[PDB]
Amino acid sequence: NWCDGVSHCPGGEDENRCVRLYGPNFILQVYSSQRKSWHPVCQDDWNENYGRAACRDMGYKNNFYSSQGIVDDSGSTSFMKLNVDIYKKLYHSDACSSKAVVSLRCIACGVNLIVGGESALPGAWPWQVSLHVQNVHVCGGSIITPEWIVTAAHCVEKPLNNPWHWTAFAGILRQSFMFYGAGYQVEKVISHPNYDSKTKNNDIALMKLQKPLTFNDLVKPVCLPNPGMMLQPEQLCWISGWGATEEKGKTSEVLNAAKVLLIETQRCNSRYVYDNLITPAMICAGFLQGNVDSCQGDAGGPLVCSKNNIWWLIGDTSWGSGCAKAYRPGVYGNVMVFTDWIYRQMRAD
Amino acid sequence: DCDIDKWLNNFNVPSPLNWERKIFSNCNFNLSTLLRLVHTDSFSCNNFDESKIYGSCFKSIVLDKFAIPNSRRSDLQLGSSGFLQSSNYKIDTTSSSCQLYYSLPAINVTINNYNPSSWNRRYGFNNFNLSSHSVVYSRYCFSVNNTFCPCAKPSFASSCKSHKPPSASCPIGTNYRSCESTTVLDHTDWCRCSCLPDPITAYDPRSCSQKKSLVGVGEHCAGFGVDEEKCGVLDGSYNVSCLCSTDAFLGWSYDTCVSNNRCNIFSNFILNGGTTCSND
Numbered sequence: 192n193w194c195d196g197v198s199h200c201p202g203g204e205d206e207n208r209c210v211r212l213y214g215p216n217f218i219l220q221v222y223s224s225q226r227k228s229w230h231p232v233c234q235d236d237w238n239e240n241y242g243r244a245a246c247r248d249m250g251y252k253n254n255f256y257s258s259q260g261i262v263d264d265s266g267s268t269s270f271m272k273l274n275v276d277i278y279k280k281l282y283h284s285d286a287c288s289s290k291a292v293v294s295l296r297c298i299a300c301g302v303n304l305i306v307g308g309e310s311a312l313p314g315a316w317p318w319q320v321s322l323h324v325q326n327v328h329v330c331g332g333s334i335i336t337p338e339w340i341v342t343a344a345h346c347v348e349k350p351l352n353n354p355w356h357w358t359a360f361a362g363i364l365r366q367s368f369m370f371y372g373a374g375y376q377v378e379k380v381i382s383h384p385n386y387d388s389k390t391k392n393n394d395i396a397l398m399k400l401q402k403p404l405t406f407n408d409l410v411k412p413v414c415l416p417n418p419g420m421m422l423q424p425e426q427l428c429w430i431s432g433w434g435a436t437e438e439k440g441k442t443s444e445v446l447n448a449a450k451v452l453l454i455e456t457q458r459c460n461s462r463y464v465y466d467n468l469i470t471p472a473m474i475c476a477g478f479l480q481g482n483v484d485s486c487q488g489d490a491g492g493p494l495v496c497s498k499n500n501i502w503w504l505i506g507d508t509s510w511g512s513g514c515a516k517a518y519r520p521g522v523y524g525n526v527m528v529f530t531d532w533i534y535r536q537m538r539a540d
Numbered sequence: 541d542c543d544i545d546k547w548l549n550n551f552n553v554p555s556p557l558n559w560e561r562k563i564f565s566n567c568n569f570n571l572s573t574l575l576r577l578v579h580t581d582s583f584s585c586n587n588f589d590e591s592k593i594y595g596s597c598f599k600s601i602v603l604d605k606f607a608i609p610n611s612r613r614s615d616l617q618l619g620s621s622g623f624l625q626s627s628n629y630k631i632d633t634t635s636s637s638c639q640l641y642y643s644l645p646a647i648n649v650t651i652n653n654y655n656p657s658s659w660n661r662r663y664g665f666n667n668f669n670l671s672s673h674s675v676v677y678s679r680y681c682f683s684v685n686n687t688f689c690p691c692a693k694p695s696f697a698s699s700c701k702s703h704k705p706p707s708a709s710c711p712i713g714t715n716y717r718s719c720e721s722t723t724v725l726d727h728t729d730w731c732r733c734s735c736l737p738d739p740i741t742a743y744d745p746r747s748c749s750q751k752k753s754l755v756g757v758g759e760h761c762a763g764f765g766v767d768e769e770k771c772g773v774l775d776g777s778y779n780v781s782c783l784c785s786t787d788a789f790l791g792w793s794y795d796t797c798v799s800n801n802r803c804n805i806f807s808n809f810i811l812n813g814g815t816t817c818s819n820d
């Protein structure tokens with residue numbers, strides 16, 4: 192009674208999300224109401240036309256990159272075969288002739304060439320966006336699709352909740368070259384409906400451009416995380432932005448980047464770091480010794496991790512205490528959690 | 541008449557934490573007798589020929605003795621880096637020395653467990669509440685400056701709303717525990733202090749005033765690390781002295797020296813250079 196094709200729901204929250212990609216290999220899975228679980232789609236009688244159908248229903252509109260078959264690595268026993276919405280064209284089977292599982296990529300992403308870091312090179316972080324208000328850097332963001340940018344919700348609180356205040360600059364490393372009209376205009380700003388301004392819970396927001404970005408050698412998307420990333424307890428990740436290079440400093444002229452490690456929530460919630468302040472929707476990153484971390488002006492900036500040769504968007508700069516201080520790691524929004532919300536908004540457009 | 545064997549057979553035997561040294565000079569000795577008056581398990585020499593002891597003369601012979609924990613005899617193998625040879629007594633490798641392993645009857649032997657660290661005693665360390673034949677050894681050693689004090693300033697602590705530290709008065713000449721008041725969202729007087737959670741597993745060793753160190757040749761353990769969250773009292777004042785509780789002292793443990801009803805004892809013989817002749 193989740194994806195049976197029956198609307199019976201005032202918001203349509205269930206029907207809107209029945210198709211997903213799984214793990215680092217973008218395995219296509221569909222939710223079945225009969226068994227109340229996700230099952231991989233097999234490649235027998237599967238083609239690009241079906242792949243495109245699945246992308247559009249996943250909020251990627253008319254974007255499509257590739258579709259091919261892989262050997263299963265999700266550890267599934269039951270697979271769905273192709274016989275309405277794409278998820279309604281599938282039925283359960285024990286074993287499919289092709290024995291190959293559909294791997295679907297709806298967009299080309301995750302490919303490239305702050306305190307305690309160093310100046311970024313051209314093409315090093317193609318997804319970086321500088322978000323200006325009154326032609327002054329306020330926050331950053333990350334490119335996910337040509338017209339969609341991920342940022343933080345605390346950045347866009349009233350009266351900055353009005354889209355016409357914001358312009359986005361991409362492909363530019365230096366603030367001095369972010370000229371008055373060289374950026375893109377934001378048409379709408381959407382903040383998470385359960386955002387808590389006192390605890391900064393669910394601190395995520397999306398911005399949509401009225402003029403889609405043109406992707407090239409310098410400007411590219413970063414991949415949204417799939418369910419089942421299975422990252423290491425101490426994953427090697429990168430942060431970047433135009434924030435201050437020192438506590439109580441001023442905005443940096445050029446994009447800087449630094450390498451950080453992820454920190455387990457179990458440790459962050461201890462009394463000696465952030466006594467029970469870190470929710471499932473939050474990720475810690477940085478070092479417990481300080482030295483390397485984000486700072487003022489990096490809000491909304493991406494936290495990206497490399498796995499399977501792909502750069503994934505794991506989090507976004509949200510809050511912290513001090514600036515690169517001991518026992519006080521930066522805290523990022525957990526994008527892996529908000530991924531379903533993001534798809535619902537990209538699709539409902 | 542050096543009388544080394546009487547010193548070795550003295551039933552007041554130190555733990556590795558406070559090993560004792562004695563210097564024998566201007567006297568005669570006989571190794572054959574020495575190794576018969578003590579129940580020797582093993583005797584070997586390092587960078588020195590054992591057979592050359594007989595008939596030779598030395599400027600002086602220096603002996604360092606202590607009880608051996610059952611579980612850590614192997615820690616006394618030269619070149620090892622466990623606990624006994626790195627936090628208690630380091631064995632030299634460049635000097636001519638001989639290592640004597642021997643034992644005394646447990647029924648007579650009494651272990652002297654004493655903490656030689658002045659900064660531990662200064663701030664409330666007393667004695668070891670241990671049973672007979674318990675041998676105390678250090679696992680981690682910490683050194684501090686002459687300005688060290690584990691308690692927060694009463695004036696500082698009085699202003700804390702979250703994570704308020706223990707506080708007390710400190711000895712004249714020392715500094716108070718380093719703490720600061722921060723804000724973590726709507727939390728405004730969130731007090732952040734050093735050596736957390738403790739000096740052994742501290743997340744940031746650079747912020748802590750207690751530095752780890754290893755013992756070199758001829759010196760004892762710098763001292764036990766202190767849990768600064770147990771020193772002084774919560775909501776304290778200048779009317780109370782900065783004293784630590786017994787379970788504030790970390791980085792030490794103990795075992796028994798008992799095999800076949802005997803206590804195993806280590807004695808390192810250092811041959812220096814004389815008149816100290818082995819006319820055996």
Ligand SMILES: *[C@@H]1O[C@H](CO)[C@@H](O[C@@H]2O[C@H](CO)[C@@H](O)[C@H](O)[C@H]2NC(C)=O)[C@H](O)[C@H]1NC(C)=O
Pocket residue numbers: 274282
């Ligand atoms: C593939 O889809 C077709 C859709 O027509 C299924 O055929 C229908 O099956 C239902 C029973 O579930 C019958 O009541 C309809 O009358 C059938 N329609 C026709 C035209 O025969 C077909 O069973 C599906 N195949 C599988 C394996 O599920």
Ligand SMILES: *[C@@H]1O[C@H](CO)[C@@H](O)[C@H](O)[C@H]1NC(C)=O
Pocket residue numbers: 647648
């Ligand atoms: C050792 O203890 C036994 C107890 O029976 C006693 O008879 C003996 O004299 C003691 N020897 C020494 C040197 O204390």
Ligand SMILES: *[C@@H]1O[C@H](CO)[C@@H](O)[C@H](O)[C@H]1NC(C)=O
Pocket residue numbers: 667668669670
């Ligand atoms: C050990 O603790 C007991 C109390 O349980 C006390 O009576 C005894 O004297 C203590 N021993 C030493 C050596 O402090």
Ligand SMILES: *[C@@H]1O[C@H](CO)[C@@H](O)[C@H](O)[C@H]1NC(C)=O
Pocket residue numbers: 685748749
């Ligand atoms: C201890 O004293 C040394 C100087 O000998 C100084 O460099 C060091 O910073 C001091 N440490 C503390 C915690 O005061």
